[model samples]
Target: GSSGSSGPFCAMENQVLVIRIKIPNSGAVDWTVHSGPQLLFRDVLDVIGQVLPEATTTAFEYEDEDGDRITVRSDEEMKAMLSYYYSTVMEQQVNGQLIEPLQIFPRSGPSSG
Candidate 1:
């Protein structure tokens, strides 16, 4: 235990992310992973991992500099892409509570009428 640590967590630093994920065998879905605007990318990943350890085959999309979907994924490139999005795309959260950004089914019925 490193009790000597003295780092402050700020609400302003927290952020929100509504990522559209491609789960293995389940097509696409939006799964949120955030430090609630109070931490780093590594923090978010840790929390997300704990919350859903079985979601190993998950994937998402992010646009590169010229606004194009970055689709290549290896170990190094994957980290780079995640880091880039964390530094750029993820929004700065205003509230302390994390957003429940998920939708499993269509908002409206297939055809209730």
Candidate 2:
């Protein structure tokens, strides 16, 4: 019988994925999620809204390492974005390096524009 890790097996993400959203001109919001199979992207926004009522409720966006501005619209797309960010962060950690929080900015909102 094998017990846990022997020499680093190819395993999927079963551990909890911790995420932190860096807000502009304010503090960051940190939350945890189980892997990445059962969760809605809207839930995260709702969490942010609940924490920061003044925060924009319309939408948010984040820039990837490729210098591409990704706008999260639909629920599915948002989830995908999170997954990518999560994986990237995890990879960085695996390499014994740290990365900045997933910085998010308001695209179009009454508070910003």
Candidate 3:
């Protein structure tokens, strides 16, 4: 007999991601992207920029379990970012609960003279 569904652990395999980008003074926006273990951080930034306002300066960051804000820069850093939250959401999904969207904020890097 089928009791609706069975528990299954489907690890990261080209997971379709829906990230929430929140810019200053604006409502949160949902951006859907196809992601894998090898996705590049630079690529993510590009996509985010496309959805943002013209001439907008943006940065991506996520708070770690230690409450430290780690700015996403290089591909390796992005791996660390995904390693944490990606597992988080996957586990949450197993419980039939909605996962939290990746939060984005404006934190322009060093200014040029």
- Which candidate's TM-score is highest? 3
Question: Residue 107 CA error for candidate 3 (Å)?
Answer: 2.6
lDDT per residue for candidate 3 within 1-113, as digits (tens), equals 11333555424565667666665566877766555464567666776777664534445777766758678766777788778777777777888988787665535445523
User: Model 3 reaches what TM-score against the true structure?
Assistant: 0.68
RMSD of 2: 8.8
> Which portions of model 2 show Cα errors greater than 4 Å?
1-13, 106-108, 111-113
Steric clashes per prediction: 4, 0, 0
Which residue pairs overlap in candidate 2's backbone?
none
Q: lDDT tens string, model 1, 77-99? A: 45665566555544323434443
**Which pairs of residues collide in candidate 1?**
13-37, 14-37, 14-38, 15-37
Which residues of candidate 1, in runs, are more than 4 Å off? 1-16, 22-28, 35-61, 90-113
Q: Against the hidden reference, what TM-scores do the models get?
A: 0.35, 0.64, 0.68
Q: Which stretches of candidate 3 lie over 4 Å from their true place?
A: 1-14, 53-59, 94-96, 109-113
lDDT of each: 0.42, 0.63, 0.64
